[PDB]
Design a protein around this ligand. Structure first.
Ligand code: CA
Lengths: 4, 223
């Protein structure tokens, strides 16, 4: 999971 | 945006680019002085760029306006991305016209299956990187709560929803964060996070804007  | 299409110049007139000497995130114009973006996009030195198509060429119709206020939600959590919303006040009001226009806030939440338009200048590849010159668009549906929680167990709060495609190939990506998810003319989402991009069983996760309409209105009224 990572910010976009 | 991975698996999308070229929008066409100024066909998404509420889309903004946040620029710090380069495009770093998107946003949505909600009135002539205020933009909605993601809290995780916050930094100093933000210039809002309205009316853009090719972000690397001055084509006409652009307005570049400095941010005068950047207001992250007070309950934003940078580890979980809960409350991933920020308001930006423009130093001067934008000039509104067919190519630069606001988007309405929701009056109610959107249901599973509602079709939306997601846009931005983010990465167009699911593996590796390619950043576009022109704005890209993707049509995508809102997923059920159950499907969203199955994809991201323990990670979906009441202030989030999933949209996109479980088969892979069509999604938002890095560089799209902060940008709009518009459904039936209303800003229902903000590009927030996901696991990879356009991967099977890993749809995009979006801030649920309908939960924040009163906070937006109250914050704008007091600033
Ligand atoms: Ca341009």
């Amino acid at each position: 999971a990572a910010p976009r | 945006i991975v698996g999308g299409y070229t929008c066409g110049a100024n066909t998404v007139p509420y889309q903004v680019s946040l620029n710090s000497g380069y495009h770093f995130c998107g946003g949505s114009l909600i009135n002539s002085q205020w933009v909605v973006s993601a809290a995780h996009c916050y930094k100093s030195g933000i210039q809002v760029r309205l009316g853009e198509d090719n972000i690397n060429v001055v084509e006409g119709n652009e307005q570049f306006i400095s941010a005068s206020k950047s207001i992250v939600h007070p309950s934003y959590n940078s580890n979980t991305l809960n409350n991933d919303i920020m308001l930006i006040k423009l130093k001067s009001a934008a000039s509104l016209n067919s190519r630069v226009a606001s988007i309405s806030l929701p009056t109610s939440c959107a249901s599973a299956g509602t079709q939306c338009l997601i846009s931005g200048w983010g990465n167009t590849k699911s593996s590796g990187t390619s950043y576009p010159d022109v704005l890209k668009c993707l049509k995508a549906p809102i997923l059920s709560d159950s499907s969203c929680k199955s994809a991201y167990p323990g990670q979906i709060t009441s202030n989030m929803f999933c949209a996109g495609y479980l088969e892979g190939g069509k999604d938002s990506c890095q560089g799209d964060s902060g940008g709009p998810v518009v459904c039936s003319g209303k800003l229902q989402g903000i590009v927030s996070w996901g696991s990879g991009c356009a991967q099977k069983n890993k749809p995009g996760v979006y801030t649920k804007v309908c939960n924040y309409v009163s906070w937006i209105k109250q914050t704008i009224a007091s600033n």
